[PDB]
CSV table of C-alpha atoms and ligand atoms in Angstrom, one decimal:
chain,number,residue,atom,x,y,z
M,1,UNK,CA,0.0,0.0,0.0
M,2,UNK,CA,1.9,3.0,-1.4
M,3,UNK,CA,2.8,5.5,1.4
M,4,UNK,CA,2.1,8.3,-0.9
M,5,UNK,CA,-1.7,7.8,-0.3
M,6,UNK,CA,-1.4,8.0,3.5
M,7,UNK,CA,-3.1,11.4,3.5
M,8,UNK,CA,-6.3,9.8,2.2
M,9,UNK,CA,-6.7,8.1,5.5
M,10,UNK,CA,-7.3,11.4,7.3
M,11,UNK,CA,-10.6,13.3,7.1
M,12,UNK,CA,-10.9,15.7,4.1
M,13,UNK,CA,-14.0,16.8,2.2
M,14,UNK,CA,-12.2,16.2,-1.1
M,15,UNK,CA,-9.5,13.6,-1.8
M,16,UNK,CA,-8.3,13.9,-5.4
M,17,UNK,CA,-5.6,11.7,-7.0
M,18,UNK,CA,-4.5,12.8,-10.4
M,19,UNK,CA,-1.8,11.0,-12.4
M,20,UNK,CA,-0.8,9.2,-15.5
M,21,UNK,CA,-1.4,5.6,-16.5
M,22,UNK,CA,-0.4,2.8,-14.2
M,23,UNK,CA,0.3,5.1,-11.3
M,24,UNK,CA,-1.5,2.9,-8.8
M,25,UNK,CA,-4.2,5.3,-7.8
M,26,UNK,CA,-7.1,2.9,-8.5
M,27,UNK,CA,-5.6,0.1,-6.5
M,28,UNK,CA,-4.7,2.4,-3.7
M,29,UNK,CA,-8.2,3.9,-3.4
M,30,UNK,CA,-10.0,0.5,-3.7
M,31,UNK,CA,-7.7,-0.8,-1.0
M,32,UNK,CA,-8.4,2.1,1.4
M,33,UNK,CA,-12.2,1.9,0.7
M,34,UNK,CA,-12.2,-1.8,1.4
M,35,UNK,CA,-10.3,-1.2,4.7
M,36,UNK,CA,-12.8,1.5,5.6
M,37,UNK,CA,-15.8,-0.6,4.9
M,38,UNK,CA,-14.3,-3.3,7.2
M,39,UNK,CA,-14.3,-0.9,10.1
M,40,UNK,CA,-17.1,1.7,9.7
M,41,UNK,CA,-20.8,1.3,8.7
M,42,UNK,CA,-20.2,3.5,5.6
M,43,UNK,CA,-22.4,3.8,2.5
M,44,UNK,CA,-20.1,4.2,-0.5
M,45,UNK,CA,-21.3,5.4,-3.8
M,46,UNK,CA,-19.0,4.5,-6.7
M,47,UNK,CA,-19.9,6.8,-9.6
M,48,UNK,CA,-18.7,7.5,-13.1
M,49,UNK,CA,-19.8,9.5,-16.1
M,50,UNK,CA,-21.2,6.5,-18.0
M,51,UNK,CA,-21.9,3.0,-16.9
M,52,UNK,CA,-23.6,1.1,-19.7
M,53,UNK,CA,-23.1,-2.1,-17.8
M,54,UNK,CA,-22.0,-3.1,-14.3
M,55,UNK,CA,-18.7,-4.4,-15.8
M,56,UNK,CA,-17.8,-0.7,-16.5
M,57,UNK,CA,-17.7,0.1,-12.7
M,58,UNK,CA,-15.0,-0.6,-10.1
M,59,UNK,CA,-16.9,-3.5,-8.6
M,60,UNK,CA,-14.6,-6.1,-10.0
M,61,UNK,CA,-11.5,-4.2,-8.8
M,62,UNK,CA,-13.1,-4.1,-5.3
M,63,UNK,CA,-13.8,-7.8,-5.4
M,64,UNK,CA,-10.2,-8.5,-6.6
M,65,UNK,CA,-8.9,-6.4,-3.7
M,66,UNK,CA,-11.0,-8.3,-1.2
M,67,UNK,CA,-9.8,-11.6,-2.5
M,68,UNK,CA,-6.2,-10.5,-2.7
M,69,UNK,CA,-6.0,-9.5,0.9
M,70,UNK,CA,-7.9,-12.6,2.0
M,71,UNK,CA,-11.0,-10.8,3.3
M,72,UNK,CA,-13.6,-12.8,1.2
M,73,UNK,CA,-15.4,-14.4,4.2
M,74,UNK,CA,-16.2,-11.0,5.6
M,75,UNK,CA,-18.3,-9.8,2.6
M,76,UNK,CA,-21.5,-10.4,0.7
M,77,UNK,CA,-21.0,-10.0,-3.1
M,78,UNK,CA,-23.9,-9.5,-5.5
M,79,UNK,CA,-24.2,-8.4,-9.1
M,80,UNK,CA,-24.3,-4.7,-8.2
M,81,UNK,CA,-23.5,-4.6,-4.5
M,82,UNK,CA,-20.8,-5.3,-2.0
M,83,UNK,CA,-21.6,-5.4,1.7
M,84,UNK,CA,-19.5,-6.0,4.8
M,85,UNK,CA,-21.1,-8.6,7.1
M,86,UNK,CA,-19.8,-7.0,10.3
M,87,UNK,CA,-20.3,-3.3,9.8
M,88,UNK,CA,-23.0,-3.5,7.2
M,89,UNK,CA,-21.0,-1.0,5.1
M,90,UNK,CA,-22.3,-1.1,1.5
M,91,UNK,CA,-20.9,-0.3,-1.9
M,92,UNK,CA,-23.2,0.8,-4.8
M,93,UNK,CA,-22.5,1.6,-8.4
M,94,UNK,CA,-24.1,4.1,-10.7
M,95,UNK,CA,-23.4,6.0,-13.9
M,96,UNK,CA,-24.3,9.7,-13.6
M,97,UNK,CA,-25.4,10.1,-17.2
M,98,UNK,CA,-27.4,6.9,-17.0
M,99,UNK,CA,-29.2,7.4,-13.8
M,100,UNK,CA,-29.2,11.0,-12.7
M,101,UNK,CA,-32.6,10.7,-11.0
M,102,UNK,CA,-31.6,7.7,-9.0
M,103,UNK,CA,-28.4,9.5,-7.9
M,104,UNK,CA,-30.3,12.6,-6.6
M,105,UNK,CA,-32.5,10.3,-4.5
M,106,UNK,CA,-29.7,8.4,-2.8
M,107,UNK,CA,-29.6,9.0,0.9
M,108,UNK,CA,-27.0,8.6,3.7
M,109,UNK,CA,-23.9,8.5,1.4
M,110,UNK,CA,-20.7,8.8,3.4
M,111,UNK,CA,-18.2,8.4,0.6
M,112,UNK,CA,-18.5,9.0,-3.1
M,113,UNK,CA,-15.7,7.7,-5.3
M,114,UNK,CA,-15.7,9.1,-8.8
M,115,UNK,CA,-13.4,7.0,-11.0
M,116,UNK,CA,-12.1,7.9,-14.4
M,117,UNK,CA,-13.2,11.4,-13.4
M,118,UNK,CA,-11.7,13.0,-16.5
M,119,UNK,CA,-14.8,11.8,-18.4
M,120,UNK,CA,-17.1,13.6,-15.9
M,121,UNK,CA,-18.8,16.6,-17.4
M,122,UNK,CA,-19.7,19.9,-15.6
M,123,UNK,CA,-23.4,18.9,-15.7
M,124,UNK,CA,-22.6,15.6,-14.0
M,125,UNK,CA,-20.6,17.2,-11.2
M,126,UNK,CA,-23.5,19.7,-10.8
M,127,UNK,CA,-25.9,16.8,-10.3
M,128,UNK,CA,-23.6,14.6,-8.1
M,129,UNK,CA,-21.9,17.0,-5.7
M,130,UNK,CA,-25.1,18.5,-4.0
M,131,UNK,CA,-26.3,14.9,-3.3
M,132,UNK,CA,-23.2,14.1,-1.1
M,133,UNK,CA,-24.5,16.4,1.7
M,134,UNK,CA,-24.2,14.3,4.9
M,135,UNK,CA,-22.0,16.1,7.5
M,136,UNK,CA,-18.5,14.7,7.2
M,137,UNK,CA,-19.2,12.9,4.0
M,138,UNK,CA,-16.3,12.8,1.5
M,139,UNK,CA,-15.8,12.9,-2.3
M,140,UNK,CA,-12.9,10.9,-3.6
M,141,UNK,CA,-11.8,11.5,-7.2
M,142,UNK,CA,-9.3,9.7,-9.4
M,143,UNK,CA,-8.4,10.9,-12.9
M,144,UNK,CA,-5.9,11.1,-15.7
M,145,UNK,CA,-5.8,14.7,-16.8
M,146,UNK,CA,-7.1,15.3,-20.3
M,147,UNK,CA,-7.3,19.0,-21.2
M,148,UNK,CA,-6.5,21.7,-18.6
M,149,UNK,CA,-9.8,23.5,-19.6
M,150,UNK,CA,-12.0,20.4,-18.9
M,151,UNK,CA,-14.3,20.9,-15.9
M,152,UNK,CA,-12.7,18.2,-13.7
M,153,UNK,CA,-9.3,19.8,-14.0
M,154,UNK,CA,-10.6,23.4,-13.5
M,155,UNK,CA,-12.7,22.2,-10.5
M,156,UNK,CA,-10.1,20.5,-8.5
M,157,UNK,CA,-6.8,21.9,-9.7
M,158,UNK,CA,-7.1,25.4,-11.1
M,159,UNK,CA,-10.0,26.7,-8.9
M,160,UNK,CA,-10.0,24.2,-6.1
M,161,UNK,CA,-12.6,23.9,-3.3
M,162,UNK,CA,-11.9,24.3,0.4
M,163,UNK,CA,-10.4,21.3,2.2
M,164,UNK,CA,-9.0,19.4,-0.7
M,165,UNK,CA,-6.2,16.8,-0.4
M,166,UNK,CA,-4.7,16.7,-3.9
M,167,UNK,CA,-2.1,14.0,-4.8
M,168,UNK,CA,-0.2,14.0,-8.0
M,169,UNK,CA,1.3,10.6,-8.9
M,170,UNK,CA,2.9,8.8,-11.8
M,171,UNK,CA,4.3,5.3,-12.5
M,172,UNK,CA,7.5,6.3,-10.7
M,173,UNK,CA,5.4,6.4,-7.5
M,174,UNK,CA,4.2,2.9,-8.0
M,175,UNK,CA,6.6,0.4,-6.4
M,176,UNK,CA,4.5,-2.4,-7.9
M,177,UNK,CA,4.6,-1.0,-11.5
M,178,UNK,CA,4.2,-4.2,-13.5
M,179,UNK,CA,6.4,-5.2,-16.4
M,180,UNK,CA,3.5,-5.3,-18.9
M,181,UNK,CA,2.9,-1.6,-18.3
M,182,UNK,CA,6.6,-0.7,-18.2
M,183,UNK,CA,7.0,-2.1,-21.7
M,184,UNK,CA,4.0,-0.1,-23.0
M,185,UNK,CA,5.4,3.0,-21.3
M,186,UNK,CA,9.0,2.7,-22.6
M,187,UNK,CA,7.7,1.9,-26.0
M,188,UNK,CA,5.6,5.1,-26.0
M,189,UNK,CA,8.3,7.2,-24.5
M,190,UNK,CA,10.5,6.4,-27.5
M,191,UNK,CA,7.9,6.6,-30.2
M,192,UNK,CA,6.1,9.8,-29.2
M,193,UNK,CA,7.7,11.7,-26.3
M,194,UNK,CA,4.9,14.3,-26.2
M,195,UNK,CA,2.2,11.7,-26.1
M,196,UNK,CA,4.2,9.9,-23.4
M,197,UNK,CA,4.2,13.0,-21.2
M,198,UNK,CA,0.4,13.2,-21.5
M,199,UNK,CA,-0.4,9.5,-21.0
M,200,UNK,CA,2.3,8.4,-18.7
M,201,UNK,CA,3.4,11.6,-16.8
M,202,UNK,CA,-0.3,12.8,-16.6
M,203,UNK,CA,0.4,16.2,-18.1
M,204,UNK,CA,-2.8,17.7,-19.4
M,205,UNK,CA,-3.1,19.2,-22.9
M,206,UNK,CA,-2.8,22.9,-22.5
M,207,UNK,CA,-2.0,26.0,-24.6
M,208,UNK,CA,1.6,26.7,-25.4
M,209,UNK,CA,2.6,30.2,-24.3
M,210,UNK,CA,3.5,30.5,-28.0
M,211,UNK,CA,-0.1,29.6,-29.2
M,212,UNK,CA,-1.9,32.2,-31.3
M,213,UNK,CA,-5.5,31.2,-30.9
M,214,UNK,CA,-7.2,30.6,-27.5
M,215,UNK,CA,-9.9,28.0,-26.9
M,216,UNK,CA,-12.0,30.5,-25.0
M,217,UNK,CA,-12.1,32.7,-28.2
M,218,UNK,CA,-13.3,29.7,-30.2
M,219,UNK,CA,-16.1,29.0,-27.7
M,220,UNK,CA,-17.3,32.6,-27.8
M,221,UNK,CA,-17.1,32.6,-31.6
M,222,UNK,CA,-19.3,29.5,-31.7
M,223,UNK,CA,-22.7,30.9,-32.9
M,224,UNK,CA,-21.5,34.4,-32.2
M,225,UNK,CA,-23.7,35.6,-35.1
M,226,UNK,CA,-26.7,34.3,-33.2
M,227,UNK,CA,-25.4,35.6,-29.9
M,228,UNK,CA,-24.9,39.1,-31.3
M,229,UNK,CA,-27.7,39.1,-33.8
M,230,UNK,CA,-26.2,39.4,-37.2
M,231,UNK,CA,-26.3,37.2,-40.3
M,232,UNK,CA,-23.8,36.1,-43.0
M,233,UNK,CA,-23.2,38.6,-45.8
M,234,UNK,CA,-20.4,38.4,-48.4
M,235,UNK,CA,-18.9,35.9,-50.8
M,236,UNK,CA,-18.7,32.2,-50.1
M,237,UNK,CA,-15.0,31.2,-49.8
M,238,UNK,CA,-13.8,27.6,-49.7
M,239,UNK,CA,-10.4,26.1,-49.3
M,240,UNK,CA,-8.8,22.7,-49.5
M,241,UNK,CA,-5.7,21.2,-47.8
M,242,UNK,CA,-4.6,18.2,-49.8
M,243,UNK,CA,-2.4,17.0,-46.9
M,244,UNK,CA,0.3,14.6,-48.2
M,245,UNK,CA,1.0,11.0,-49.0
M,246,UNK,CA,0.7,10.0,-45.4
M,247,UNK,CA,-2.3,8.9,-43.3
M,248,UNK,CA,-3.5,12.5,-42.3
M,249,UNK,CA,-6.9,13.5,-43.4
M,250,UNK,CA,-7.4,16.1,-46.1
M,251,UNK,CA,-9.1,19.3,-45.1
M,252,UNK,CA,-11.9,21.5,-46.4
M,253,UNK,CA,-13.4,24.7,-44.9
M,254,UNK,CA,-16.1,27.0,-46.2
M,255,UNK,CA,-17.5,30.3,-45.0
M,256,UNK,CA,-20.2,32.7,-46.1
M,257,UNK,CA,-18.7,36.1,-45.2
M,258,UNK,CA,-17.9,36.1,-41.5
M,259,UNK,CA,-19.9,32.9,-40.8
M,260,UNK,CA,-18.1,29.5,-41.2
M,261,UNK,CA,-20.5,26.9,-42.6
M,262,UNK,CA,-18.6,23.7,-43.3
M,263,UNK,CA,-15.5,21.9,-41.9
M,264,UNK,CA,-14.9,18.5,-43.6
M,265,UNK,CA,-12.2,15.8,-43.5
M,266,UNK,CA,-11.2,13.6,-46.5
M,267,UNK,CA,-10.0,10.1,-45.6
M,268,UNK,CA,-8.4,7.4,-47.8
M,269,UNK,CA,-8.1,9.7,-50.9
M,270,UNK,CA,-5.3,10.2,-53.4
M,271,UNK,CA,-4.5,13.7,-54.6
M,272,UNK,CA,-7.0,13.6,-57.5
M,273,UNK,CA,-9.8,12.0,-55.4
M,274,UNK,CA,-9.2,14.7,-52.8
M,275,UNK,CA,-9.4,17.5,-55.3
M,276,UNK,CA,-12.5,16.0,-56.8
M,277,UNK,CA,-14.0,15.8,-53.3
M,278,UNK,CA,-13.1,19.4,-52.3
M,279,UNK,CA,-14.1,21.1,-55.6
M,280,UNK,CA,-17.4,19.2,-55.5
M,281,UNK,CA,-18.0,20.6,-51.9
M,282,UNK,CA,-17.1,24.0,-53.1
M,283,UNK,CA,-19.7,23.8,-55.9
M,284,UNK,CA,-22.3,22.4,-53.4
M,285,UNK,CA,-21.5,25.3,-51.0
M,286,UNK,CA,-22.0,27.8,-53.8
M,287,UNK,CA,-18.4,29.0,-53.5
M,288,UNK,CA,-17.4,32.3,-55.2
M,289,UNK,CA,-13.7,31.7,-54.4
M,290,UNK,CA,-11.7,28.5,-53.9
M,291,UNK,CA,-8.1,28.2,-52.7
M,292,UNK,CA,-5.9,25.1,-52.1
M,293,UNK,CA,-2.5,24.5,-50.7
M,294,UNK,CA,0.0,24.3,-53.5
M,295,UNK,CA,3.2,24.1,-51.4
M,296,UNK,CA,3.3,20.3,-51.4
M,297,UNK,CA,1.5,17.5,-53.1
M,298,UNK,CA,-1.0,20.1,-54.3
M,299,UNK,CA,1.4,21.9,-56.6
M,300,UNK,CA,0.0,20.1,-59.7
M,301,UNK,CA,-3.8,20.4,-59.0
M,302,UNK,CA,-4.4,23.6,-61.0
M,303,UNK,CA,-5.6,21.9,-64.2
M,304,UNK,CA,-8.0,19.5,-62.4
M,305,UNK,CA,-9.2,22.3,-60.2
M,306,UNK,CA,-10.0,24.8,-63.0
M,307,UNK,CA,-11.6,22.0,-65.0
M,308,UNK,CA,-13.9,21.1,-62.2
M,309,UNK,CA,-15.2,24.7,-62.2
M,310,UNK,CA,-15.5,25.1,-65.9
M,311,UNK,CA,-18.6,27.0,-66.8
M,312,UNK,CA,-18.9,28.5,-63.4
M,313,UNK,CA,-17.5,31.8,-62.2
M,314,UNK,CA,-15.5,30.5,-59.3
M,315,UNK,CA,-12.0,31.9,-58.7
M,316,UNK,CA,-9.3,29.4,-58.1
M,317,UNK,CA,-6.1,30.3,-56.2
M,318,UNK,CA,-3.1,28.3,-55.4
M,319,UNK,CA,-2.1,29.2,-51.9
M,320,UNK,CA,1.6,29.0,-51.1
M,321,UNK,CA,2.0,29.6,-47.4
M,322,UNK,CA,5.8,29.9,-47.7
M,323,UNK,CA,5.6,33.0,-50.0
M,324,UNK,CA,6.2,36.5,-48.9
M,325,UNK,CA,3.0,38.1,-47.6
M,326,UNK,CA,0.2,39.3,-49.9
M,327,UNK,CA,0.6,43.1,-50.6
M,328,UNK,CA,3.9,43.2,-48.7
M,329,UNK,CA,4.8,46.8,-49.5
M,330,UNK,CA,1.4,48.1,-48.2
M,331,UNK,CA,1.3,49.9,-44.8
M,332,UNK,CA,0.5,47.5,-42.0
M,333,UNK,CA,-2.9,48.2,-40.4
M,334,UNK,CA,-3.6,46.7,-37.0
M,335,UNK,CA,9.6,54.9,-41.5
M,336,UNK,CA,6.2,53.2,-42.1
M,337,UNK,CA,5.9,49.6,-41.1
M,338,UNK,CA,4.7,47.4,-44.0
M,339,UNK,CA,2.9,44.1,-44.1
M,340,UNK,CA,6.2,42.6,-45.2
M,341,UNK,CA,7.9,43.9,-42.1
M,342,UNK,CA,5.3,42.3,-39.9
M,343,UNK,CA,4.7,38.8,-41.4
M,344,UNK,CA,7.3,36.4,-42.6
M,345,UNK,CA,5.0,34.7,-45.1
M,346,UNK,CA,1.4,34.2,-46.1
M,347,UNK,CA,0.9,31.3,-43.7
M,348,UNK,CA,1.6,33.7,-40.8
M,349,UNK,CA,-0.3,36.6,-42.4
M,350,UNK,CA,-3.5,34.6,-42.7
M,351,UNK,CA,-3.3,32.7,-39.5
M,352,UNK,CA,-3.1,36.1,-37.8
M,353,UNK,CA,-6.0,37.4,-39.9
M,354,UNK,CA,-8.0,34.5,-38.4
M,355,UNK,CA,-6.7,35.0,-34.8
M,356,UNK,CA,-7.5,38.7,-35.1
M,357,UNK,CA,-11.1,38.0,-36.2
M,358,UNK,CA,-11.6,35.5,-33.5
M,359,UNK,CA,-10.2,37.8,-30.8
M,360,UNK,CA,-12.4,40.6,-31.9
M,361,UNK,CA,-15.4,38.3,-31.8
M,362,UNK,CA,-14.4,37.1,-28.3
M,363,UNK,CA,-14.2,40.7,-26.9
M,364,UNK,CA,-17.6,41.4,-28.5
M,365,UNK,CA,-19.4,38.4,-27.0
M,366,UNK,CA,-17.7,38.3,-23.7
M,367,UNK,CA,-16.9,42.0,-23.0
M,368,UNK,CA,-19.6,43.6,-25.0
M,369,UNK,CA,-17.1,45.6,-27.0
M,370,UNK,CA,-18.5,46.7,-30.4
M,371,UNK,CA,-17.1,45.5,-33.6
M,372,UNK,CA,-18.2,45.3,-37.2
M,373,UNK,CA,-19.5,41.8,-38.0
M,374,UNK,CA,-17.4,42.0,-41.2
M,375,UNK,CA,-14.3,41.9,-39.0
M,376,UNK,CA,-15.5,39.0,-36.8
M,377,UNK,CA,-15.8,35.3,-37.4
M,378,UNK,CA,-18.6,33.0,-36.2
M,379,UNK,CA,-18.9,29.2,-36.4
M,380,UNK,CA,-22.3,28.0,-37.4
M,381,UNK,CA,-22.4,25.0,-35.0
M,382,UNK,CA,-25.6,23.5,-36.4
M,383,UNK,CA,-24.3,23.7,-40.0
M,384,UNK,CA,-20.8,22.5,-39.2
M,385,UNK,CA,-21.7,19.8,-36.7
M,386,UNK,CA,-20.3,19.4,-33.2
M,387,UNK,CA,-18.0,16.6,-34.2
M,388,UNK,CA,-16.1,18.5,-36.9
M,389,UNK,CA,-16.2,21.7,-34.9
M,390,UNK,CA,-14.4,20.0,-32.0
M,391,UNK,CA,-11.8,18.5,-34.3
M,392,UNK,CA,-11.1,21.9,-35.8
M,393,UNK,CA,-10.9,23.6,-32.4
M,394,UNK,CA,-8.4,20.9,-31.2
M,395,UNK,CA,-6.1,21.8,-34.1
M,396,UNK,CA,-6.5,25.6,-34.0
M,397,UNK,CA,-5.3,25.7,-30.4
M,398,UNK,CA,-2.0,24.1,-31.3
M,399,UNK,CA,-0.9,26.6,-33.9
M,400,UNK,CA,2.2,28.1,-32.4
M,401,UNK,CA,4.4,31.2,-33.1
M,402,UNK,CA,8.1,30.5,-33.4
M,403,UNK,CA,11.1,32.7,-32.7
M,404,UNK,CA,12.2,34.7,-35.8
M,405,UNK,CA,15.6,36.4,-36.2
M,406,UNK,CA,14.2,39.4,-38.0
M,407,UNK,CA,11.5,40.0,-35.5
M,408,UNK,CA,8.7,39.0,-37.9
M,409,UNK,CA,5.7,36.9,-37.1
M,410,UNK,CA,6.3,33.3,-38.1
M,411,UNK,CA,4.5,30.1,-37.2
M,412,UNK,CA,5.8,26.5,-36.7
M,413,UNK,CA,5.3,24.6,-39.9
M,414,UNK,CA,2.9,21.6,-40.2
M,415,UNK,CA,6.0,19.3,-40.5
M,416,UNK,CA,7.6,20.9,-37.4
M,417,UNK,CA,4.4,20.4,-35.4
M,418,UNK,CA,4.2,16.7,-36.3
M,419,UNK,CA,7.9,16.3,-35.5
M,420,UNK,CA,7.8,18.2,-32.2
M,421,UNK,CA,4.2,17.8,-31.0
M,422,UNK,CA,3.7,14.2,-32.2
M,423,UNK,CA,0.3,15.1,-33.7
M,424,UNK,CA,-1.3,14.6,-37.1
M,425,UNK,CA,-1.0,17.6,-39.6
M,426,UNK,CA,-3.6,20.3,-38.6
M,427,UNK,CA,-5.3,20.2,-42.0
M,428,UNK,CA,-8.7,21.5,-40.9
M,429,UNK,CA,-7.1,24.5,-39.2
M,430,UNK,CA,-4.9,25.2,-42.3
M,431,UNK,CA,-8.0,24.9,-44.6
M,432,UNK,CA,-9.8,27.4,-42.5
M,433,UNK,CA,-6.7,29.7,-42.5
M,434,UNK,CA,-6.6,29.7,-46.3
M,435,UNK,CA,-10.2,30.8,-46.7
M,436,UNK,CA,-9.2,34.0,-44.8
M,437,UNK,CA,-7.5,35.1,-48.1
M,438,UNK,CA,-9.4,36.7,-51.0
M,439,UNK,CA,-6.9,37.9,-53.6
M,440,UNK,CA,-9.0,37.4,-56.7
M,441,UNK,CA,-11.2,40.3,-57.6
M,442,UNK,CA,-14.6,39.5,-59.2
M,443,UNK,CA,-18.0,40.8,-59.9
M,444,UNK,CA,-21.0,39.2,-61.6
M,445,UNK,CA,-20.6,41.7,-64.4
M,446,UNK,CA,-16.8,41.6,-64.9
M,447,UNK,CA,-13.8,39.4,-65.5
M,448,UNK,CA,-12.0,37.7,-62.7
M,449,UNK,CA,-9.0,40.0,-62.0
M,450,UNK,CA,-5.9,38.7,-60.1
M,451,UNK,CA,-3.7,41.7,-59.3
M,452,UNK,CA,0.1,41.1,-58.7
D,501,AGS,N1,-0.5,-1.8,-3.9
D,501,AGS,C1,-0.3,-2.6,-5.0
D,501,AGS,N2,0.0,-3.9,-4.9
D,501,AGS,C2,0.3,-4.7,-5.9
D,501,AGS,N3,0.2,-4.2,-7.2
D,501,AGS,C3,-0.1,-2.9,-7.4
D,501,AGS,C4,-0.4,-2.1,-6.3
D,501,AGS,N4,-0.7,-0.8,-6.8
D,501,AGS,C5,-0.6,-0.9,-8.1
D,501,AGS,N5,-0.3,-2.1,-8.5
D,501,AGS,C6,-0.1,-2.6,-9.9
D,501,AGS,O1,0.0,-1.5,-10.7
D,501,AGS,C7,-1.0,-1.6,-11.8
D,501,AGS,C8,-1.6,-0.2,-11.9
D,501,AGS,O2,-2.3,0.3,-10.8
D,501,AGS,P1,-3.6,1.1,-11.1
D,501,AGS,O3,-4.1,1.4,-9.7
D,501,AGS,O4,-4.5,0.3,-11.9
D,501,AGS,O5,-3.1,2.5,-11.7
D,501,AGS,P2,-4.0,3.6,-12.3
D,501,AGS,O6,-3.3,4.9,-12.0
D,501,AGS,O7,-5.4,3.5,-11.9
D,501,AGS,O8,-3.9,3.3,-13.9
D,501,AGS,P3,-4.8,4.0,-15.0
D,501,AGS,O9,-5.0,5.6,-15.1
D,501,AGS,O10,-6.1,3.1,-14.7
D,501,AGS,S1,-4.2,3.0,-16.6
D,501,AGS,C9,-2.0,-2.5,-11.3
D,501,AGS,O11,-2.6,-3.2,-12.3
D,501,AGS,C10,-1.2,-3.5,-10.4
D,501,AGS,O12,-0.7,-4.4,-11.2
D,502,MG,MG1,-7.2,3.2,-12.9
C-alpha cells in the first residue's frame, strides 16, 4: 500500500488523486475503501460519467482487492453490490449520465468515489456534488488529466474547493509497477515523447505560451452571429488542404462572409480524389472563391481544379504559405511599417487574420465591445456539426508562433508540429486559415482579375 496515499486516511471533504497511466491510484483507493468498509458502517457510492453495464464500474476491482487481501469471508457479493457482514458497510455503483434521478434520490452516502473522473462533465458534477451532503461525507476522485480546460481539472486543480487533499502521482510512485505496463510506457516514451508525457506523466493538454488562438475565443465565436444578432453577408469562400501521401486526413473549410458553414475531412483519398471531393464541396457550397495548398502534393492540381469549375464563375487560387505576404509593401494596419515587415510569409499573415477576427469576436461576445461583423468570425455550429467543430478547435489551439531572427511573425510549420508535438497535420485548421484570403477580384458583371 503506497505510502504516498497515506493522506487519504485522514478526514478531508475532497480527496483527489491525479496522475498518468499505471500510477496505482485505482488500486490504492480500492484498498483504502475496502479497509474503511471493514471498520465503519459506511455507505459508499461508486460513480462514473457513463456506466452502460455493471462491468464498467469498479466492482470487479473491489472484489479482486477483497480476495487478494484474503477478506472474502467477511463480505457479501452480489451483481451490483458489496456489503461487509460485520459493519453493514455497503458499496453501490451508478453512472451519472445513465441514472441522474436515482443518484439525486440516494440518501446517507458517506463516501463517493468518482473513478475515471476525466470523463465527468460539468453537468454531471453539478448533479452529483449536491447529493453528497451528509455532514463529514467525502468525495474521492481519481483521474488522468485530459485538457486543462476540462471541468474536472478546472474544478479540482485550477480553482479548487476548500479542504482538498490533492495528490499527483505517476508510475515512478508505484513500487509495484508491472512489467507489462513498463513495456508499453518505454515503447511510448521512445515513439512519441509528447504523447508519453500526457499519457504516462499525466500532463494535461494545454495551450503553449506561443499559441496564437485561444480555446476561449473559439467557444465565444461559436454561434457568435446568433449571440450578437447578425447574419452572414459576403462571398462564399472555400479552401482545401490536400495533406500529403501520409495517413493524415485532407481538409476543407467554407464560409459565407464572416460565418463558417462547413468543416470537412477527407479520408483514404489520393491527390485527385481529394481535389474532386473538395471542388465538389465548393460547388455544393455555392463558392465564389476557392483556394488550395500548392506548397506540397497540391502543386499540380491547377488543371484539375479549374476543369472542375469550368462553366462556373468561381475563382481558383493556389495558396503558397511559404511565399512573402500578400501586398507586402502596403502599410500594415492593426519609417512606415509594412505588411512585409510584420509577417514572414502568407501562412503567418492569414493565421493572424484568423486569430484577429476570433479575438475581436471574443471581446464582443464576452466583454460587450462593439465590432463590425465583417471583422469578426462566427462558427455556425448547427451547420458544421459538433464533431467536426471540435476536431477543428483541437487543431487551432495548437498553432504556435516560433522565434524569428528578423522580429517577424512566423509560425511553426505543419511538418515541425508533427515532428515536435507528435500530432497529425492540422489540415482542418490550415484549410480554415486559407479561406481567410481573397486575392481574386470578381463581380457578376466583370472578369476575374488577379492583381500582382
Ligand atoms: N498496492 C499494489 N500492490 C500490488 N500491485 C499494485 C499495487 N498498486 C498498483 N499495483 C499494480 O500496478 C498496476 C496499476 O495500478 P492502477 O491502480 O490500476 O493504476 P492507475 O493509475 O489507476 O492506472 P490508470 O490511469 O487506470 S491506466 C496494477 O494493475 C497493479 O498491477
Ligand atoms: Mg485506474
